Design a protein around this ligand. Structure first.
Ligand SMILES: CCOc1cncc(-c2ccc(C(=O)NC3(c4csc(NS(=O)(=O)C5CC5)n4)CC3)nc2)n1
Ligand SMILES: CCOc1cncc(-c2ccc(C(=O)NC3(c4csc(NS(=O)(=O)C5CC5)n4)CC3)nc2)n1
Ligand SMILES: CCOc1cncc(-c2ccc(C(=O)NC3(c4csc(NS(=O)(=O)C5CC5)n4)CC3)nc2)n1
Ligand SMILES: O=c1ccn([C@@H]2O[C@H](COP(=O)(O)OP(=O)(O)OP(=O)(O)O)[C@@H](O)[C@H]2O)c(=O)[nH]1
Ligand SMILES: O=c1ccn([C@@H]2O[C@H](COP(=O)(O)OP(=O)(O)OP(=O)(O)O)[C@@H](O)[C@H]2O)c(=O)[nH]1
Ligand SMILES: O=c1ccn([C@@H]2O[C@H](COP(=O)(O)OP(=O)(O)OP(=O)(O)O)[C@@H](O)[C@H]2O)c(=O)[nH]1
Ligand SMILES: NC(=O)CC[C@H](N)C(=O)O
Ligand SMILES: NC(=O)CC[C@H](N)C(=O)O
Ligand SMILES: NC(=O)CC[C@H](N)C(=O)O
Ligand SMILES: [Mg+2]
Ligand SMILES: [Mg+2]
Ligand SMILES: [Mg+2]
Lengths: 542, 542, 542
């Protein structure tokens, strides 16, 4: 087996997960079966513990693993599906070792970081790297291990020590360390500052890992004198220092790695006998003259990364219909009349963006904060016939709203926002949380999503929800415009709903965005982009 | 006595010397006598060893100390004149300790970093901090010590260890540590990254210095959540975290420190019973509608810091005449006909900037590289009557050119560029280098500079030159337009020259820029700005 | 070329220089030309700056290099003669780099530890390792580099960083790191503590050097469980962990390294196609039934290392005559009547040891402290006919005393102790210090030392003295018992003196001990041991 460790210097946020994902897509293009492991050095067992504002979107796996958005980047760049244990954390490792200790598996010896935690990491990495994430029932050739955090993070040091040891088991033909670092430039008239990279590589070398590649992230291109200054002081050959400057689309980041000779490096070092899909997407993306203006009416909108998979699913869809996405990230609280009193300019800016909406997206979330502003946008979409996609909470809200405004059940709500709702239309219905892959069966042949999904009898999509439509109160909707077109395989759960009288007003109980890929846009997001540009009728006739 | 140590985190280039200088100007405005010490952890004994491209302009002191540009920042923000030993270096400290060892001053004991190097640093700091740089024959109250480099620089660690000890001699009412750090933001839609500051303060605390203040440098203002994230993880109170964002003029950086409560901090902690000069310069600077376009025809143009004092002297002058400076930094190599062949677009851009020149500045330098381009600009200035200031080399070239073009001595040059010049007009004339403060006597009452300097019989200016006008060959100029208006007190050295037939064409052998202050622009730079805007005649009548 | 770096862990004093010297003698026995370099990370330029109490005896080289006693260990274990620059120090390296900087040799670039100091170290090591110390005019095969101090010493870190780099120039077939560490055991009923060795190797690995061998120094043998505990936690194979316990003679330390497979390691790794001299000395040493009791009347007796070469020269001599040395180190201050008042028990113990003296040794030193006690012992030796060897100061005192007691010149002394001595018999006579190898010519054919030295016309011996016999005042001795048998080649300096009436009472102005080797005892020390056992007359007839 082969291992590429991707370590972070100075700051984590410089697209190290895009480097790791692009490294994987280069190896994929070279014909290798590639798997990926994320290490998050936090003590948290899973990302299901987090607010979206902490690390971005909580990405959901088929097995119901709630993981970091970098696992989503692996699944978007590589045609893989990951499992829970492809996310390593310090919490998972320490609990495993504690559980072993409490069983006496360590034979009455003093359990300590080296060896036992560092053994557990190597054990985990070896065993999980053999797992078929590629869908093909064959062990992969190469594992791209992203070591999250920075090489200054004290929690990460056990993993760096584990990899120092691992580098001597999996030899230098097997184990590669790529170090991703920031080269800041405070002003364009001063030197590009290599000192953070020098200091960061000195730290990494102090932990006993040698950079095979140093990836210098910068805004502008790195000057050749600055490249040589990195080479000398990091003690690495000029071929091993690569410049990843900012580029016009994500699709060029694999190409820039290719241009910088990373493909050559790995082809030489691994002995591998190109990225035309990436070049095709890239060159097409710059030439898109048309725009589709989508309103994302989100509550987590304060950091755009909170809806990363959602945005990427829209951009897959936008690219597939040859339009640029104008994603009007609206903070949903701004649409509420509370903000008309408190900040009237933000209110009228938000409502102006909602007027400019060719389509409206209401993504999922938990709680009532900003959730009346979601209802304001769904009401606007419903009445003014604007193309609508409601995800999870956005389905629940649409069902509640149709009950209020079209069935006159003004007392309808969720047993989330008001536990003692008079007609509890949305209710808590655990399985625990309905979490990971579930089969939704189509129960209406004339549904829009069925046809977008290829006229299939069922779909299997990723869920992350506790609340459901109350199955008695479906009787209110029975012969009215809002039709529950999709149900669970157990029947007693309504998983897709459509307005029969509207060109595109979809509620889905699942999260389609997690299943979206660059050349396979998730059909509910595709339908939104299609409807917003009038192409839906043409597409469905085609 | 009081001591403020200013330490650098992440990267040095974030204006830490402007923080140190602004800290001093705050204390100056509070009525304190302030001195300054620069520590440069390099093994170089002086900045006279450097190319300008290495650290910026080699600033020259009255005693002939060739020092870092930060000593120039101290002299510009504080009305002080510094001495050689206000620049500490590792070279100076280690040589001192070696010299002591070789005399047996360490009594046959094993000389080592702690104590002996760290004692030498504390010895030096205590003794030099008592020196009257303020011109007043009274020991200053406070010493601002800028620790150059970064807190990751291994050479700096002896000084941090020395200051750890010093903090226990000079107690916490005396000794303050300000830590200047970078908070980068890779994109405006991602978090402002405090992790470099966290890691940097953890390193500083590991070296046994506690931040009294953490100065967060950033482009944009720091968000309050980011400020609290710094406060928690750096283990410092919110009042001690200050945001220094980018601002519209240098004159606002003291004011922003004042606004962030740094003046309050030091007034409270030092027990001091405001920055109106700074506010006056700042608010006036933004309101300047007029522009003066100056061509800086400088061989070291590749980094603007190579002419920092020169640019600052022009900006002092520009502000004093209520004009904005359009400083057209021209690489003189681009004006040479070599570049007409090799890069014709750069040539015609450079010559277009030279056409747009309201005044022409030829700053000093060493070597023949770019000298023909300086001569091209001096020729242009001489013939087309464009206001000219030649500094040192620019005087030597003007004298050589007038000999070539006006006296027909086409064989004239320096014994620098051609040692065996047929008529050696500019010759090596050591005292070594004519270095630091020397008295130039005016020997022509009708000279422009005499009147700009206040109609004085002599001036004392800072020199840095080995070459002189050959005193025999002055006979060629004797009765012609180019008059040697200023000479040394020894007579045998020509130190200022003027074209009598030109509105402003000045050669000075000294560097006037080192003596320039914000409310006292150096008169040769003032005369250039005045001549370039026609105001010179009005000023000299006034 | 090949390089063995010998690095110190926990504490320096565990015989790391004996490991380095024994490593060299193993390679010597394998037929290699071996040179040695000592690095002392102190800022001191030479050991001539030190008191003997600081680091032990200041060993003197042929060129007049005053160096550490470890250079003496190299010269005793290897048949080499070293030069000044085989002692590297931080002082020497930093001064060299400063001198280069001041000449502009670093081309105006910022001089700093990495690269420039670490380059200077590698430069020095490469160039000095090519030097023929072996007397044969051929470059040696292997350089044993002892890195002095500990791997915790901050001054040493530049050398460890230099060797990290050097390990990548001189590859792993060329460059070996041996780490010498202490494994303490607080009581025999508790575990042998490997944690200092674990922590020390973790530090060394953090500096980027991997132990090829870990030498565990201990009192008792290392237990196999403790050896495995070192192996696991230091991350090294059991063959690379060696136990060097305490052994009955120095001659067994090469043999114990051989037994532990260090000879096998280097024979395998270097590809070399045994230590019988060492075994012969060792096995003979344990079987010596006879004892020779020598009084060493030395002012520096407080640390025995202050007379290391002297003690080793006596032990070479003792072994050569098949006697054990009872070296009665007497602090000469105890023989003085001052101590009869202040500490009468020490006085009578010292005088009892002087009564038990089969021979008396008065080693060299500087200053009047303990000189009266040396004179007391010389008086005792002179009158009671006890075999005497006076080295340098011991010659000067013997000449002064014979003048006082036998010529009645009671006013005689040195212009060291009393500058204004009435008859200045011992005077300052610089060449500075008469330092290193000088030719002493024999000028009396019937002298004892001439015959001990093989009946040679002259000898060349190592000197370290400023004072001489005043050549006029030789007229007092002219026809009396004290004959100046040896003079310098310049004649005007008396370098050996003998009492013609005494069986062995020798003053030598040089230090014979520095020239002494295990199978070539220095003849003045041999003559002392021979005279003290009556064998001198037999030897001189033989
Ligand atoms: C080392 C990184 O350095 C640099 C340097 N320069 C630029 C970027 C860069 C980073 C992120 C983005 C981005 O997020 N763009 C979007 C998108 C569409 S599809 C997708 N990702 S994806 O589906 O996982 C799979 C197909 C790729 N992202 C539109 C939203 N665009 C540019 N990154
Ligand atoms: C912690 C620093 O943070 C920030 C934040 N925002 C902005 C700046 C900033 C830094 C440098 C400059 C600058 O160099 N400006 C010029 C000038 C004129 S006078 C002088 N300096 S001076 O004479 O020493 C004495 C009077 C002050 N400089 C025009 C050339 N302008 C802005 N610095
Ligand atoms: C890694 C070291 O571990 C251990 C373990 N166990 C024991 C010792 C040990 C260390 C020093 C001594 C010592 O100094 N002994 C003496 C002597 C005679 S000759 C000479 N040295 S020598 O001439 O340089 C060359 C011929 C060798 N020394 C009598 C004075 N004896 C034993 N060292
Ligand atoms: O204020 C000062 C004083 C001294 N120095 C010293 O100058 C040398 C270079 O320090 P720099 O920070 O310029 O580092 P560099 O050129 O190696 O890396 P980048 O600029 O690309 O980030 C180091 O030895 C440092 O301590 C400064 O950087 N700044
Ligand atoms: O890729 C990953 C995985 C895990 N983590 C982990 O998340 C935690 C926060 O890591 P951050 O880099 O977000 O740090 P911070 O929020 O304290 O500081 P700034 O963003 O302002 O720079 C740390 O425990 C780290 O190891 C990541 O940062 N990124
Ligand atoms: O007082 C205590 C508590 C705990 N421990 C813990 O026990 C473990 C072993 O700590 P030891 O000091 O016994 O180390 P070791 O056995 O690896 O090495 P030596 O004894 O040969 O020197 C470590 O994890 C330490 O923190 C103690 O050593 N002592
Ligand atoms: N994923 C979501 O949008 C969650 C919706 C809702 N709070 C539930 O748990 O059903
Ligand atoms: N300061 C300068 O411009 C130097 C000018 C010239 N090279 C000299 O040495 O005189
Ligand atoms: N080496 C010695 O014993 C020194 C003796 C005496 N102090 C001198 O300087 O000559
Ligand atoms: Mg730099
Ligand atoms: Mg963060
Ligand atoms: Mg133990």
């Amino acid at each position: 087996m082969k291992y590429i460790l991707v370590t972070g210097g100075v700051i984590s946020g410089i697209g190290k997960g895009i480097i790791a994902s692009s490294i994987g897509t280069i190896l994929k293009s070279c014909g290798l079966r590639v798997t990926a492991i994320k290490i998050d050095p936090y003590i948290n067992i899973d990302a299901g513990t987090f607010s979206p504002y902490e690390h971005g979107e909580v990405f959901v796996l088929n097995d119901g693993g709630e993981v970091d958005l970098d696992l989503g980047n692996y699944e978007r760049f590589l045609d893989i599906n990951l499992y829970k244990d492809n996310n390593i954390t310090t919490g998972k490792i320490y609990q495993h070792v504690i559980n072993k200790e409490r069983r006496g598996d360590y034979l009455g010896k003093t359990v300590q970081v080296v060896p036992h935690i560092t053994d557990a990491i190597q054990e985990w990495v070896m065993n999980q790297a053999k797992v078929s994430v590629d869908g093909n029932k064959e062990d992969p050739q190469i594992c791209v291990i992203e070591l999250g955090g920075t090489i200054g993070d004290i929690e990460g040091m056990a993993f760096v020590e584990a990899f120092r040891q691992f580098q001597f088991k999996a030899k230098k033909e097997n184990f590669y360390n790529i170090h991703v670092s920031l080269v800041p430039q405070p002003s364009a008239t001063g030197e590009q500052k290599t000192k953070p990279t020098q200091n960061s590589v000195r730290a990494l070398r102090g932990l006993g890992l040698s950079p095979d590649l140093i990836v210098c992230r910068s805004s502008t291109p790195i000057e050749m004198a600055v490249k040589e200054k990195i080479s000398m002081f990091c003690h690495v050959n000029p071929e091993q220092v690569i410049c990843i400057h900012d580029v016009s689309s994500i699709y060029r980041v694999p190409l820039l790695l290719e241009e910088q000779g990373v493909v050559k490096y790995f082809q030489e070092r691994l002995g591998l006998p190109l990225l035309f899909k990436w070049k095709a997407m890239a060159d097409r993306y710059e030439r898109l003259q048309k725009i589709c203006s989508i309103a994302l009416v989100g509550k987590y909108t304060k950091l755009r990364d909170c809806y990363a998979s959602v945005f990427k699913a829209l951009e897959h869809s936008a690219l597939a219909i040859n339009h640029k996405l104008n994603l009007m990230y609206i903070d949903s609280i701004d649409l509420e009349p509370v903000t008309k009193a408190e900040d009237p300019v933000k209110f009228h800016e938000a409502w102006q963006k909602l007027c400019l909406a060719d389509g409206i997206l209401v993504p999922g979330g938990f709680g009532i904060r900003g959730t009346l502003g979601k209802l304001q946008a769904i009401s606007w979409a419903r009445t003014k016939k604007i193309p609508f996609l409601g995800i999870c909470l956005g389905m629940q809200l649409a069902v509640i709203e149709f009950a209020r405004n079209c069935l006159n059940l003004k007392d309808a709500n969720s047993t989330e926002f008001e536990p003692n709702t008079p007609v509890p239309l949305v209710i808590d219905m655990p399985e625990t949380m309905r979490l990971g892959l579930r089969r939704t069966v189509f129960t209406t042949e004339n549904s829009i999503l069925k046809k977008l999904y290829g006229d299939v009898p069922y779909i299997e999509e990723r869920h992350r929800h506790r609340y459901e439509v109350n199955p008695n109160l479906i009787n209110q909707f029975e012969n009215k415009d809002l039709c529950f077109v999709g149900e669970d395989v157990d029947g007693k759960r309504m998983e897709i709903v459509e307005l029969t009288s509207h060109p595109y007003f979809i509620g889905v109980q699942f999260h389609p965005e997690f299943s979206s890929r660059p050349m396979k846009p998730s059909p509910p997001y595709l339908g939104l982009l299609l409807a917003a540009t009038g192409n839906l009728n043409a597409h469905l006739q085609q």
